[PDB]
From Swiss-Prot, chain A:
The record marks 93 as: Essential for proton translocation. One of its GO terms (cellular component) is membrane. GO terms for biological process: endosomal lumen acidification; Golgi lumen acidification; proton transmembrane transport; vacuolar acidification. GO terms for molecular function: P-type proton-exporting transporter activity; proton-transporting ATPase activity, rotational mechanism. The lineage of its organism: Eukaryota, Fungi, Dikarya, Ascomycota, Saccharomycotina. Residues 68-85, 151-168 are vacuolar. The chain crosses the membrane at residues 1-20, 47-67, 86-106, 130-150, 169-189. InterPro entries: ATPase_proteolipid_c-like_dom, ATPase_proteolipid_csu, F/V-ATP_Csub_sf. It comes from Saccharomyces cerevisiae (strain ATCC 204508 / S288c). This is V-type proton ATPase subunit c''. Pfam families: ATP-synt_C. Proton-conducting pore forming subunit of the V0 complex of vacuolar(H+)-ATPase (V-ATPase), a multisubunit enzyme composed of a peripheral complex (V1) that hydrolyzes ATP and a membrane integral complex (V0) that translocates protons. V-ATPase is responsible for acidifying and maintaining the pH of intracellular compartments. Residues 21-46, 107-129, 190-198 are cytoplasmic.
Curated annotation (Swiss-Prot), chain C:
Residues 22-44 are cytoplasmic. V-ATPase is a heteromultimeric enzyme composed of a peripheral catalytic V1 complex (components A to H) attached to an integral membrane V0 proton pore complex (components: a, c, c', c'', d, e, f and VOA1). The chain crosses the membrane at residues 1-21, 45-63. Its main location: endoplasmic reticulum. It comes from Saccharomyces cerevisiae (strain ATCC 204508 / S288c). Accessory component of the V0 complex of vacuolar(H+)-ATPase (V-ATPase), a multisubunit enzyme composed of a peripheral complex (V1) that hydrolyzes ATP and a membrane integral complex (V0) that translocates protons. V-ATPase is responsible for acidifying and maintaining the pH of intracellular compartments. This is V-type proton ATPase subunit f.
UniProtKB/Swiss-Prot annotation, chain E:
Keywords: Acetylation, Hydrogen ion transport, Ion transport, Membrane, Transport, Vacuole. It comes from Saccharomyces cerevisiae (strain ATCC 204508 / S288c) (Baker's yeast). Its main location: membrane. One of its GO terms (biological process) is vacuolar transport. The gene is VMA6. It is found in: Vacuole membrane. Pfam families: vATP-synt_AC39 (PF01992). It comes from the Eukaryota. One of its GO terms (molecular function) is proton-transporting ATPase activity, rotational mechanism. GO terms for cellular component: fungal-type vacuole membrane; Golgi membrane; proton-transporting V-type ATPase complex; vacuolar proton-transporting V-type ATPase complex; vacuolar proton-transporting V-type ATPase, V0 domain. This is V-type proton ATPase subunit d. Subunit of the V0 complex of vacuolar(H+)-ATPase (V-ATPase), a multisubunit enzyme composed of a peripheral complex (V1) that hydrolyzes ATP and a membrane integral complex (V0) that translocates protons. V-ATPase is responsible for acidifying and maintaining the pH of intracellular compartments. This subunit is a non-integral membrane component of the membrane pore domain and is required for proper assembly of the V0 sector. Might be involved in the regulated assembly of V1 subunits onto the membrane sector or alternatively may prevent the passage of protons through V0 pores. Present with 1630 molecules/cell in log phase SD medium.
From Swiss-Prot, chain M:
The keyword Ligase does not apply. One of its GO terms (biological process) is endosomal lumen acidification. SUPFAM superfamilies: F1F0 ATP synthase subunit C. The gene is VMA3. It is a multi-pass membrane protein. Residues 30-51, 111-122 are cytoplasmic. The keyword Transmembrane applies. InterPro entries: ATPase_proteolipid_c-like_dom, ATPase_proteolipid_csu, ATPase_proteolipid_su_C_euk, F/V-ATP_Csub_sf. This is V-type proton ATPase subunit c.
């Protein structure tokens, strides 16, 4: 595998570079902390917002087509399932709803800072908070949409057999969507403490 | 407080953003180049019972 | 039968290279990296030519 | 500022909480998705076993609750106006990695075990007790990481 | 199996919808008590088949027509699914098609050893194992000409180049060696293709099921070769499927066996087959195990093996319909309960 | 090279503008290709549905519209001495709309292909099909509105 | 003209083909160096080691090393690279020379004659 | 080496102008390759449509025309004493047009291949071919507008 | 922060106490999944053997117990000042126990699957199966011993 | 601290101590897994050989015993403010023994699987199979002895 | 530490000493494993060849002995204040012997496997086996010679 | 260390001296392994050709001798205070001979395998097999030429 | 300042790669051609000499690699300008990878050609023509290496 050999190569190169820096006595030169400090917190905040909404929508659309392909496949013989099963699409698009809500909330905490303020304690806090909350929400809703789409596909297949199977299986997708709801709650909570850049 | 002159903080941000961009681009091309056409519904098979 | 023509050319090649070595020629000896000692290597190559001639006689006696 | 509390510690703490929540969610979703595969597989033939066999889905939900508890109890004690030792940052990162990877392991195990056990529960009913026992083992597997996460945070905040 | 729906989600949905049309045990019981063949058609019309057979008169109805029409509907459905398949899924169904192209080409070399007639063979060649160049392969009068007609331009190339030489098949009997060895090579190649280019759980629910296919082929070879001593064991070893639970340990003893008792000793060796041949006939137990494995193939949701499970389930379902139709038309209702239903 | 306005600040704005059309074009192309394959497979047997099954292609085009709108708005909000704040807002809007449009186009293409293959059989599947396609299109719309809000905010209190 | 399509492809083919052959003429140099330094290394690592210390064992050493050198000089060189350079000088006549004036294929002339072929086997 | 115009600014301009033809040519080549495979597979039985089903290749070449024109218009503004800002802008234009054209090339190749295989069996499908294929082309078109706007923004009021 | 006890010293200990429970959980999960697959697939035929085949699951959970113990001890050994030396030593302990437990979990899973298959095959096989499984468990036990010794050595002589 | 004894030194010692049991555990786990699959395949059929064919697992465990011995020796030789030389020599011994044991475990697992398969039929093959196991074992013995020699060189005449 | 004898110089020596047994152990283990697979797969039919056809295992052991000899020779040359030049020389020697032994073990494994399977039927294949395995193990012998020359050069006239 | 003779200069020389023998041994081993599979499978039926079909094995041995000569000559030229120029030249020569020999081993192994399988039934293909093996051998010979001439050029006219 | 101590590194790597990559390309070409020849000549021994041509005019790639390697190394220097080293590296990479591409093409074209010629002999001339157009690739790589190294010491200071 050329890609796997490339990953092993880059890993051995970074290990060799670290070993060289440590051996020379300048191992402290590679300071992750200095890299974090000297980056503008706007980078973290805006990547957080962007990846938040983008990954939430990515998970939403991923689950949507996973459930939709199966919904149509089972709808060729059982046309009655589309209306009763669009609930799967709703539960798979609510994660994009969550992503949109958190993105528009995070936009509020994005303001300008003075020359001294730029790298201040509160500014850095806010930047890193927005970044990691955005990553949390985006990825949590990504895997939420994955699970909800898979469960919705199973629900489509089962509802092709009988409606009682759909009614009983909807609990699995309910918990799948509760996954993204938990992501919503936790991301909003970890970002609530952050104050705007001013 | 001056980080490695070659790899300044601005260049580090540039390269991490470009790495994320290229990762997304590679994923998207991995998906798009994986497309295959359902040849069967298109080509005319001489099967007597298919027709 | 394979040794026949091999020894045939070997006798001539060994003889000529031996003569060049014994003549203390620039293209073979004289340089520091060269073995120098022209007479000694020339004698050894004489012996090699002699043994190739011996193989010639031994192989050609089968004809 | 005190050297033991650099300005970038909130990065480490929030990386910990993010990894905690996200990867616990990932493990829970893998478990619940494979369990749903099993449930929908047996539903066509023996739908009457769906309610009884729904246990792995609830177990994956409980795993997600573990992840949420760890994530919230990390994110509670972080603020821009409070002191924050880099020790506390690495403790929160270790907490998050602990719970995230442990619950991911337990979620994968619950997913596979629930899938195969539910699919084979259609064939004879006595398998349910073994399925639930193995599932309890697989979820206490993640409970171990949950406990490690809590003790790590309690040591870090002190 | 999250990636499975990017290209085969609709196909999986349609195949599961077709599976919902498989005759349940109640449907089979209803079909069993049919007084005559026409009443069997009437009661079958209540199922997913519907008016498929209304195109023919009641007096013209016969068990052969039953099989022909139901299998024609099966083949229409499979051709539709294949036509709407893409990529590795299309290659997998293509492989399935080769599974019967083996039989069609083996049938076609018959009537080429003795070129008595053509055309009627093409009519008898069932379409599930059809290929575009088969009509061209028909015209080849000489056996060798047909050999290079199938050695190239046909998906039969790797199997023919694997173990055959252009003049070798003249001596070999079509059924005993030629078709069985072609099934052998087909099974190793298909098992390898599954191990290489399939996703989980379709992985496992293909290796187990193709291993069962190899095992049934091996058992049939072992229990058919004993009556014909002309087959020496080393060729039999070259004929055994080389894949399955029996291999390695059992298939060698089956190859070296020379009597029914030896095959019994080497067969009850493994678990799934004690009492498997002691009581009753092989065919019924083999079909029952095939249905059990197919049912399992349907327990999985996001696996491309549902295509294979549907194919085999629907083929044995039409076989059960034909069995009941025969037991009614022949009035041999005393053994009408030999149908195998797992739905 | 101001501290608030580094010389490399236009990087993030320019690359956000580029990506806002790059990723949306990737998604729109995937959707259009998959839907076109589906249409070619479904109306080769029943060409009466050609006028109907085209809509997922139009939805992929609308995703491309979202990408274009975000990119051109960033262009109009793009300058030389702009602060890192503006450049990063443009980057964030570009990434958000690009990822959202890429996912939306992916879902539109896959659902449209599966759906038109279904509608080759079931005529009444077209309502569900348009419904699911609108649900997918709203995702790209969400990306568009996010990028719109960021860009409209990108000139609030710039140096 | 109706033959303009053939004329334009002939013209572009001729110019690019002239420059291509003129470039290809450099591999006469290439083969010359290959042969020269290959013989150089073979001699340096066979005969320049054959003499050794010029002792009694040195006689056997030089005999064996000259035997190896002759075996290589024949089998490796004059067969392998001899045929290689033969075939490359033949590539000259295949392409560079004949493409300039060989207009096309013609009917071979094989008169009806006996040849006493297959004296014993066929 | 002034701060606004570093000596390594031309990297971004050169790479943008290069990629503007590189990725557009990759997309055009993929489109022509898939479409040509389809053509050689279909016209062997239906040589009558050889001159009619040729248009997917035509607009696959139009994709490369977009790449050429954007690269040429980038060359008009690429220089030594150029600001990092305008170099980055023309890099963004190059990437945008190149990747949009690559997406359009993938879409055109897949759609045109499917369309020729289908239109071998259905004359009515060719209009659907044209419509879907123009929809695939217009995405690369939008990439061209993005690149043109970036180039128009890459020259005014630069220091 | 003295150069014996830098500010980033606790990072190594945090990674150690993480990786311990992490990798032991990975191994325990793999072993439990494989053994549970075997049990749920063989108890359909011999349901009376389930409470005997359950033992591999318990021995897989013993790996998780090992990781829990090591993580608890390291969490006790942590501290804001501590020592860089303690950091490396307890990182080594965590990695050691985690990887030893992961290897033990892989071995337990594989051999438990095989032996659970073979138990219904032959009742007498279970004693040999449990002997092999003890021999596999001794791997995780060795890793536990190494981690405990390292943790004991970590603190006693630091300044 | 001093150049000869930097604070970064015990990293290498800790990693060597960990790896010396990690990689031996991985090798022993692979060997035990393959041998256990072989046992649970064969001893189903001839249960009277489960006593005799257990020794591949026994020597797989012996490999882990080598790992334990070298790891505890390194751990005893560990210590803060140790010479940087001591750290490297301990890490070298640890990797040497660990990866030698990993290779030995690979060999033992594969050859034990093959040998138990063969000996399920032919009993006299057991002596040759055990002899080949002894060779694969003395591979790990070489690993242990080189680790011990490095450990012996680690302590004395070092500042 | 001086520039010719820096503190990190023993890194190269320790890694070389480790690898000199590691890589040769992998080579010998792979060779032994595959030769054992061959002998246990074909000797079940012909136990009489068990003594004869075990030679690839012995030659893999001889490769391991080559690695051990290099390892002990280098281990008797490490030191805290050793020259950087030495460090690189024994690192190169360790890699040379280890990887040459890896190649030799691979070759002997493949060839001995195929040879025993062939020689079961045909008895006179054994002399060819011996000759080709000598020509394969001279690879490890050549690596040994290279390692010995490097090691003998390492300590000479070095400061 | 001076500018032209750094302390890390012997790195490149030592690793060139090694990599020569490693890569040449890898090529020789691959060639020997495939040739051995071929010889065994082809002369189990026709044992009288054993003494003849062994030639590719000796040819791989000649590749190994090439690597040995390059390594032993580079080793003598290695020096403590050698110019970094000499180090780079020795590394280049080592790589240029080693990778060329690896490629030669690849080619000669494939050709020898296939040719000895071909010669089982048709005996006159032996001469063509020999000639193609010579054309594969001349690649390693070219590697020898370039490595030797770099090695000679390494030491002459050095600061 | 224009002469860093690491300047000869680029020249050394160029000289090495010029033979490395060409050797791999020629090796794959010879391997594929040889397996094709010995797979066809079993059924037709007598055409062996004519079917050998892929091997020869694939090994021409290794010949190009060797000649570039020598003409580059005879420009190596202790006090060579960084620019000389970079130009030598560029020439070496050019010839090596062009020869690698040529080796790929020659190998599989010769394989197809020998399979075809196993049936009928008129394919001989066509496979020659195609593989000529394949070997001209290594020819162009030789050209580029030659001109780069010719410029490499034009006005070096």
């Amino acid at each position: 595998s050329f890609s796997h050999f490339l990953y092993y190569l880059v890993l051995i190169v970074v290990i060799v570079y670290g070993l060289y820096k440590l051996f020379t006595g300048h191992g402290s030169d590679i300071n992750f902390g200095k890299f974090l400090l000297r980056t503008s917190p706007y980078m973290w905040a805006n990547l957080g917002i962007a990846l938040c909404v983008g990954l939430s929508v990515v998970g939403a659309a991923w689950g949507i087509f996973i459930t939709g392909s199966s919904m149509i496949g089972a709808g060729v013989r059982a046309p009655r399932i589309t209306t009763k099963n669009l609930i799967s699409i709703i539960f798979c698009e609510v994660v994009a709803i969550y992503g949109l809500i958190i993105a528009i909330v995070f936009s509020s905490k994005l303001t300008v800072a003075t020359a001294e303020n730029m790298y201040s304690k509160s500014n850095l806090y806010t930047g890193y908070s927005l970044f990691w909350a955005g990553i949390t929400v985006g990825a949590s809703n990504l895997i939420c949409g994955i699970a909800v789409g898979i469960t919705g596909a199973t629900a489509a297949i089962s509802d092709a057999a009988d409606s009682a199977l759909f009614v009983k299986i909807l609990v699995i997708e309910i918990f799948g969507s509760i996954l993204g709801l938990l992501g919503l709650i936790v991301g909003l909570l970890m970002a609530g403490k952050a104050s705007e850049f001013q | 407080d001056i980080l490695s002159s070659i790899w300044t903080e601005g260049l580090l941000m540039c390269l991490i953003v470009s790495a994320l961009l290229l990762f997304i681009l590679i994923v998207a091309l991995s998906w798009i180049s994986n497309l295959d056409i359902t040849y069967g519904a298109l080509e005319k098979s001489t099967n007597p019972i298919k027709k | 039968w394979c040794c026949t023509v091999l020894s045939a050319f070997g006798v001539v090649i060994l003889s000529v290279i031996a003569h060049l070595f014994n003549t203390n020629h620039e293209s073979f000896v004289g340089s520091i990296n060269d073995p120098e000692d022209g007479p000694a290597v020339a004698h050894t190559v004489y012996l090699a030519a002699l043994v190739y001639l011996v193989f010639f006689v031994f192989c050609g006696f089968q004809v | 500022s005190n050297i033991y509390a650099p300005l970038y510690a909130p990065f480490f703490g929030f990386a910990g909480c993010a990894a905690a929540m996200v990867l616990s969610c990932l493990g829970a979703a893998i478990g619940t998705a494979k369990s749903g595969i099993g449930i929908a597989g047996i539903g066509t033939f023996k739908p009457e076993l769906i309610m009884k066999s729904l246990i792995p889905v609830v177990m994956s939900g409980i795993l997600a609750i573990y992840g949420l508890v760890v994530a919230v109890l990390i994110a509670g004690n972080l603020s821009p106006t409070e002191d924050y030792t880099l020790f506390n940052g690495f403790m929160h990162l270790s907490c998050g990695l602990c719970v995230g990877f442990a619950c991911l392991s337990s979620g994968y195990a619950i997913g596979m075990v629930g899938d195969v056990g539910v699919r084979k529960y259609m064939h004879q009913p006595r398998l349910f007790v073994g399925i639930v026992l193995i599932l309890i083992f697989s979820e206490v597997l993640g409970l171990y990481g949950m406990i490690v996460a809590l003790i790590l945070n309690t040591r870090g905040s002190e | 199996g999250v990636y499975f729906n990017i290209d085969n989600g609709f196909i999986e949905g349609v195949v599961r919808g077709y599976r919902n049309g498989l005759l349940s045990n109640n449907q089979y019981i209803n079909l069993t008590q049919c007084d005559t063949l026409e009443d069997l058609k009437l009661q079958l019309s209540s199922t997913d088949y519907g008016n498929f057979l209304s195109s023919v008169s009641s007096e013209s109805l016969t068990t052969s027509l039953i099989q022909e029409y139901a299998s024609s509907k099966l083949y229409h459905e499979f051709n539709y699914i294949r036509d709407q398949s893409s990529g590795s899924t299309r290659k997998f169904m293509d492989y399935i098609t080769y599974g019967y192209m083996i039989d069609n080409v083996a049938l076609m070399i018959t009537g080429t050893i003795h070129d008595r007639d053509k055309g009627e063979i093409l009519q008898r060649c069932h379409p599930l194992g059809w290929f575009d160049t088969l009509p061209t392969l028909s015209v080849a009068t000489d056996l060798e000409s047909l050999y290079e007609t199938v050695l190239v331009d046909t998906p039969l190339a790797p199997y023919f180049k694997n173990c055959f030489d252009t003049a070798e098949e003249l001596d070999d009997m079509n059924i005993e060696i030629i078709r069985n060895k072609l099934y052998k090579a087909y099974l190793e190649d298909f098992y390898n293709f599954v191990t290489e280019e399939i996703p989980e759980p379709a992985k496992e629910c293909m290796q187990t099921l193709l291993g069962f296919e190899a095992d049934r082929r091996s058992i049939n070879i072992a229990l058919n070769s004993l009556q014909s001593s002309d087959i020496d064991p080393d060729l039999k070893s070259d004929l055994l499927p080389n894949i399955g639970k029996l291999y390695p340990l059992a298939t060698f003893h089956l190859a070296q066996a020379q009597d029914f008792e030896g095959v019994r000793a080497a067969l009850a060796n493994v678990y799934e087959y004690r009492g498997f041949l002691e009581t009753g006939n092989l065919e019924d137990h083999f079909y029952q195990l095939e249905m059990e494995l197919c049912r399992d193939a349907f327990t999985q949701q996001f696996a491309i093996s549902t295509v294979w499970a549907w194919m085999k389930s629907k083929e044995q379902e039409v076989r059960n319909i034909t069995w009941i139709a025969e037991c009614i038309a022949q009035n041999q209702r005393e053994r009408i309960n030999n149908y195998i239903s797992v739905y | 090279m101001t501290e608030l306005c580094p010389v490399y600040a236009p990087f993030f704005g320019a690359i956000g503008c580029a990506s806002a059309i790059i990723f949306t074009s990737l998604g729109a192309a995937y959707g259009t290709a998959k839907s076109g394959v589906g249409i070619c497979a479904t109306c080769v047997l029943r060409p009466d549905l050609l006028f109907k099954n085209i809509v997922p292609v139009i939805m992929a085009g609308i995703i491309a519209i979202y990408g274009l709108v975000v990119s051109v708005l960033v262009c109009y909000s793009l300058g030389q001495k702009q602060a890192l704040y503006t450049g990063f807002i443009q980057l964030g809007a570009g990434l958000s709309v690009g990822l959202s449009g890429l996912a939306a186009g992916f879902a539109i293409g896959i659902v449209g292909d599966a759906g038109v293959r279904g509608s080759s059989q079931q005529p009444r599947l077209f309502v569900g099909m348009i419904l699911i396609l609108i649900f997918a299109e709203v995702l790209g719309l969400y990306g568009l509105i996010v990028a719109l809000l960021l860009n409209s905010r990108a000139t609030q209190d710039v140096v | 003209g109706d033959i303009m399509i053939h004329q334009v492809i002939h013209t572009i083919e001729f110019c690019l083909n002239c420059v291509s052959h003129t470039a290809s003429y450099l591999r006469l140099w290439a083969l010359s160096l290959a042969h020269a330094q290959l013989s150089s290394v073979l001699w340096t690592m066979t005969i320049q080691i054959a003499f050794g210390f010029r002792g009694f064992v040195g006689v056997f050493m030089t005999v064996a090393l000259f035997a190896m050198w002759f075996a290589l000089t024949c089998a490796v060189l004059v067969l392998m690279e001899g045929t290689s350079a033969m075939l490359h000088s033949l590539r000259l006549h295949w392409v560079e020379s004949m493409s300039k004036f060989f207009v096309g294929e013609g009917l071979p002339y094989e008169p009806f004659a006996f040849e006493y072929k297959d004296m014993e086997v066929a």
